Every structure is written in structure tokens, then in C-alpha cells.
Amino acid sequence: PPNPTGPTNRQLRMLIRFLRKAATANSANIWRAIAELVERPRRSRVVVNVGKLNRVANDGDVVVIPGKLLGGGELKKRVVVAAVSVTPKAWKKVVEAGGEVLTIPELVRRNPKGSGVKIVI
């Protein structure tokens, strides 16, 4: 087939480069794994609904989503979530659940080693 080329979006390309550099600098394999998951082909990119966070996260958890966060279902926990992109409904639900929405570089700057950060796909 036409082999995987990588994203055509320069924002995504720069974010992947940022994550690889951060992983190399801080010796944090989490950023390398997140970059590998974000680099995936568009037909198999990670998308997570907010309802899955209800199961896979408890209160006070820091979660990184290597892809888009979509607003589906109901959220009843308070969680800090970082993602490549967030839909308006997902951001609204995360906010009224008491949680926070961050960019992945913002999460990296706040926690350089990513200690306690949970990958959610």
C-alpha cells in the first residue's frame, strides 16, 4: 500500500519533535512512548471519550492521552488530562467535573519526568 508517511500537520510534527527532545533530555521514556503513539497513522490514531476516564482514572490522577479527547458519556471524577486536542464538549465536561485540561507540552513543563502520569488510550 502507500506506506505510512507521518503527519502532514507541522503542528503535529513539531509536537513529536518536542516530545522526543524532552524524553532524551529528561531520560523519561514516557515522552518517547507518547511520541510513538502520536506519530501513528491517521486511520489508527488514538481517540478517547471522557466516559472511559471514569473507569481508567480516579480523583487526583494526571492522565496523558496520545491523541484526541472526545466528549462522550459522563464524567464524575476530578482529573488533570493532557491531550493533543480536546473537543469543546470534552473540555466542558472535564471542567464541570472539577478537572483540568492541559496541553502535552504544558504537562511536560509542569512534570519533566512525568512521574505518576498515566497513559490512557
Binding site: 502532514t8 513539531m14 509536537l15 518536542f18 486536542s85 507540552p105
Partner: protein, 278 residues
């Protein structure tokens, strides 16, 4: 709110050119600084050349016309293959007095064209409406950068500031001489001069079909509404496009599929832009 729009990659990635300021400088008819206005949200969109190229290609491909050949071309002769045994190749040949002459095959002189263009062919590349509006917002954001406009090839050394915005009184100018004075005082006359001197006779067969002159693009003028006198005042300049703000499109926002066009916005058009393409 626009944190995902402005992705800060510090410290491992050094930042690029600064985003457009929170306010926009406004200039009068005399080219002087007059006031400020709040920057519309459209100028905070990141510049995305791939999306701009896709939207521009869609807008340009919607313009092409269907082309074809005569449906019976090369096929209406009275011909037939005479089989083997005559010492000659078994392609179809003329039946009558011109008998041995080859006929109807794509390798024969006068024969049919094997795979000609068909008028039913789909030339238009459709684009989603939200995608097209996102590309338009990206191109508008690209106009506010000096680097993108220079990379496209405009002369912006003399322009006071980008995004370039003029007062709403400029829409009353109804004469080409007055509009040229306004361009001269605002620093766009060098780019109009570049277009006027860079018009050329293009190479090839376009001259016979009505494409003799290939003219560059100089300045896109944005007014608030249709039928303002400034449109008729400026529309005769070489390479200058003038549209009302609601008629903005990729064909004027990114000629050649490349972002960053030297744009003169009126202040009223900048106010009107806040509820469009969003």
C-alpha cells in the same frame, strides 16, 4: 482558550516569529497612525500551508470546464479487417477504393484516440465547509506576518505594520488617482509597481487560447460591504484584488496555493470580520 491554537514548544523548541499583537494599528487616508482596535480571533490561527494548499486547490478546481473529443471521432469510416492471407497486418482497413489504407485503430493515421478526455470526468475537488473555513482563517492569520508575505514575494519593506489596516474613510475614494495616492502613502505602491513591471508574455500554447499575459499579484483590498466606491477606485491596478469581507476566499487569500498575501484591510471590514468564517 486558544492554548491548543498557540502550541508553546518551549524550551526544547525555540519559538518562531511572534503572534500578531493584541491590538491592530489603524492608519488614516493620509497614512498616519490614528488608533488601535482589538485583534480579531481569526489572526490567532496557526499558519498551515498544507491545509491552505488543499483549500486553494479545491477553489481553483471548481472553476475548470469539461473537455472531450467528438464521440464518433476516428470511428465513422466504413472499414473492416480483411483477415490473414493477404500478406498484410490484420488491422481494420478502408472498404472502398482506398482499401489497403489502415483505419479505426489508435495506431493508424486518422484512427480513434485511445483514451481521450471525457466530459464526465470529475475535475472539482470538493472540500468540507468547516475545513474550508478553517483554511480561510489560517490564510487570514498568515496575512498578518511579514515573513509569510515576503516569502510569497510581496514588497513589504515600506509598509508601516502588518496586519495592515486603514481607516473606514478610505471606502469613499472613487478615483483611481486618489486610490493610487493612498497606496503610495501606505507603502503598497512598490508592490503594485512590481506587478505592473512583472507582467509577461507566458511561454507556450496559452497565447493562442487567450492566456498571453501572466501577471503577478500585488495587493488584496478588503472592504466592509459590496458597492463601496473604493472597489471601483482600486480594481484597475495590476495584480490588485478587492473584495468585501464576506466574500473572502482562498483564491484571493493564497494565490499559488501559498500563504501570506499583502492585504489592506479597512477598519470597518476588520470589525465585520469578527462574525464570519468562524
Amino acid at each position: 482558550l486558544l492554548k491548543f491554537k498557540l502550541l508553546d514548544l518551549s524550551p526544547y523548541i525555540k519559538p518562531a516569529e511572534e503572534r500578531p499583537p493584541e491590538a491592530l494599528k489603524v492608519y488614516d487616508v493620509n497614512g498616519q497612525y490614528m488608533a488601535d482596535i482589538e485583534t480579531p480571533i481569526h489572526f490567532y490561527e496557526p499558519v498551515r500551508p498544507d491545509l491552505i494548499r488543499r483549500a486553494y486547490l479545491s477553489a481553483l478546481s471548481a472553476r475548470f470546464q469539461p473537455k472531450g473529443v467528438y464521440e464518433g471521432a476516428g470511428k465513422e469510416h466504413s472499414c473492416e479487417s480483411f483477415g490473414v492471407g493477404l500478406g498484410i497486418a490484420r488491422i481494420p482497413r478502408y472498404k472502398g477504393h482506398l482499401w489497403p489504407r489502415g483505419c479505426f485503430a489508435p495506431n493508424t493515421r486518422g484512427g480513434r484516440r485511445a483514451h481521450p478526455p471525457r466530459p464526465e470526468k470529475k475535475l472539482h475537488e470538493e472540500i468540507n465547509w468547516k475545513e474550508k473555513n478553517l483554511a480561510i482563517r489560517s490564510a487570514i492569520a498568515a496575512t498578518a506576518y511579514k515573513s509569510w508575505v515576503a516569502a510569497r514575494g510581496h514588497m513589504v519593506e515600506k509598509v508601516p505594520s502588518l496586519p495592515l489596516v486603514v481607516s473606514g474613510d478610505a471606502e469613499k475614494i472613487a478615483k483611481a488617482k486618489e486610490a493610487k495616492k493612498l497606496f503610495e502613502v501606505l507603502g503598497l505602491w512598490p508592490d503594485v509597481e512590481r506587478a505592473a513591471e512583472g507582467v509577461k508574455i507566458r511561454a507556450g500554447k496559452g497565447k493562442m487560447r487567450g492566456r498571453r499575459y501572466k501577471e503577478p499579484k500585488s495587493v488584496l483590498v478588503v472592504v466592509s460591504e459590496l458597492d463601496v466606491p473604493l472597489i471601483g477606485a482600486v480594481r484597475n491596478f495590476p495584480g490588485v484584488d478587492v473584495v468585501p469581507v464576506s466574500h473572502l476566499n482562498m483564491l484571493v487569500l493564497a494565490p499559488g496555493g501559498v500563504p501570506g498575501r499583502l492585504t489592506l484591510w479597512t477598519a470597518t471590514a476588520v470589525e465585520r470580520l469578527k462574525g464570519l468564517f468562524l
